[PDB]
């Protein structure tokens, strides 16, 4: 019927060259997997700590790189025009690097979370770059979860140097 | 005879509060363990790539923190006055964060290496912070290796907010 074709791994591109991304990004209409990530104060943050709220996961390789830096600036602004939603900027950057960027840029709407102590999130959310120079970093992706911990939108950006589809991510939140 | 007392873990301090650091830092007169770390160009760097040269390992929690930032600035200057030696600045910061600091500061003598894809180095070199908010980051430490891959100096800084003993590290290199 409306099933998905079998995948063993995902393939994105870095300046046109193929990159293997582990497993599969969560699909719309499926249960969001539990996660623990590290906040600005070095405390542990779970998915369950955002119950009753909608969640935008803006996953990227490094906040210290241009395209990822633009996505964080965009999502910070888009957070003002969305109802009952938390915007989480997720990467393998240490909490200190993430806070330094947000601090210097005055971006206070988004919530920065590090996978530095939680490499498993990259595996479970299907964003772990498996090969090439960017191995161990997160692929560029967007995962939108509803109030009920159900995935409502998912995007694994085909080319890593391209910004994510903001409008498509925000469209599922509008009722 | 001249043996060391049995340890199961090490204890450093963060603003006076005890912090458990895994295993044991390599001791002087012992073989240096192999390692693979990630350079500025995202390439893999081994210990064997510095054969015939003496090695200063300046291990710290984050280049995006003050005390660690000072140690990198100090070691960059001290590298000019030392014979046949490579100075390696090692941390869990991503290569992008390490290069951004070195670039902005104009520090070109030191060699930055990331443990981000190689969590095992922190275990083998006895610098892995096991508990508290800083878990997963490296403890502040100095490991000096000779040309023959033998450890000649070792220091696990007792208090994490204190700078390492530069003079003692550089003293073993002088013949």
Curated annotation (Swiss-Prot), chains A, B:
It catalyses: a hydroperoxide + [thioredoxin]-dithiol = an alcohol + [thioredoxin]-disulfide + H2O. Disulfide bonds join 68-102. This is Thiol peroxidase. NCBIfam families: PRK00522.1. InterPro entries: Redoxin, Thioredoxin-like_sf, Thioredoxin_domain, TPX, Tpx_CS, Tpx_Peroxidase_subfamily. One of its GO terms (molecular function) is thioredoxin peroxidase activity. The gene is tpx. Keywords: Antioxidant, Disulfide bond, Oxidoreductase, Peroxidase, Redox-active center. Thiol-specific peroxidase that catalyzes the reduction of hydrogen peroxide and organic hydroperoxides to water and alcohols, respectively. Plays a role in cell protection against oxidative stress by detoxifying peroxides. Homodimer. Pfam families: Redoxin. Its EC number is 1.11.1.24.
């Amino acid at each position: 019927q409306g099933i998905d074709p079998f995948t063993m791994s995902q393939t994105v591109h870095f300046q046109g060259n193929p990159v293997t991304v582990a497993n599969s990004i969560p699909q719309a209409g499926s249960k969001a997997q539990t996660f623990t990530l590290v906040a600005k104060d070095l405390s542990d943050v779970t998915l369950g700590q955002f119950a009753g709220k909608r969640k935008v996961l803006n996953i990227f390789p490094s906040i210290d790189t241009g395209v990822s830096a633009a996505s964080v600036r965009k999502f910070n602004q888009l957070a003002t025009e969305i109802d009952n939603t938390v915007v989480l900027c997720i990467s393998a950057d240490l909490p200190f690097a993430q806070s330094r960027f947000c601090g210097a840029e005055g971006l206070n709407n988004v919530i920065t979370l590090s996978t530095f102590r939680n490499a498993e999130f990259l595996q479970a959310y299907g964003v772990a770059i498996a090969d090439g120079p960017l191995k161990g970093l997160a692929a560029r992706a967007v995962v939108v979860i509803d109030e009920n911990d159900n995935v409502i939108f998912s995007q694994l950006v085909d080319e890593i140097t391209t910004e994510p589809d903001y409008e498509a991510a925000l469209a599922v939140l509008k009722a």
